[PDB]
Subunit: 116 residues, 3 copies
């Protein structure tokens, strides 16, 4: 049984500005764990990681049906498994979370299906 | 069980040009209620609304494997889009997202 | 029951750039059947056909959870059915495969949901 579906696309450029404008931006979007990875990356890759996590958390909040509003981003965590696939390690959901992220040089995309 | 799946991506500029060419475009793509909402918006936001509804209907049509006036996408109190009308009696899981340049729509039909 | 979900987005210019730089790119990515339709196409359309198939194969691999590692691209095939929709004619999966592809003049995206 499907209980939610949400997608999201981000332009990397705007995540770039957000980071540049507010030094606390990434700190507010990412969890401690996520932030540790964020710090091990540098130029483009660091922004791609951040943009991907933002995209995933947004897609998840929409899958939960919050339309305008969003769940706390600190209540959501996305890590990579042994194989490099991203998944939700933390989430206010108990069912199965099917997540997928893809990206180009300028955009990042995310899709979430919730199953009960 | 899933009985259908469709997605769509649209270039916002492409939706304008359309609106620019045959101006009767929007009236043909949107329903009355949808139009009231459209004509009450302006700037980038108005084109996004149109692109968003187009994209939503395209994805749904592809999910069905198949009239836009027969489809209507509104927004609930939470701001989330959803099909208020559609030639389908099961659950329609819809999601839309957009940037300054593009819009994407994903649809999953379930029974 | 959903057992896998994957998406992918591709900038057409990247695909165009890969064909230009590598003469046998298409041959490595497309099966004999796919290669037929491909060669019968020209310009942008040809690139878009190639990009979509690559996008679809990429989305399927993620849906399988393959992560960064990947399956044979020759082990996957995407043709068009009698209703004119793209589908996997060959895939190491025995359940239902839901595929959808879409593109602009600049990008192409694919979404795959695995069910059984």
């Amino acid at each position: 049984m499907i209980v939610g579906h949400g997608i999201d696309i981000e332009e990397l450029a705007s995540i770039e500005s957000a980071v540049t404008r507010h030094e606390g931006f990434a700190k507010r979007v990412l969890t401690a764990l996520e932030m540790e990875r964020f710090t091990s990356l540098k130029g483009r890759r660091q922004i791609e990681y951040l943009a991907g996590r933002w995209s995933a958390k947004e897609a998840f909040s929409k899958a939960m049906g919050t339309g305008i509003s969003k769940l706390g981003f600190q209540d959501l965590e996305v890590l990579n498994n042994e194989r490099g696939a991203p998944y939700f390690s933390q989430a206010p959901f108990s069912g199965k979370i099917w997540l997928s992220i893809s990206h180009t040089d300028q955009f990042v995309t995310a899709s979430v299906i919730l199953e009960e």
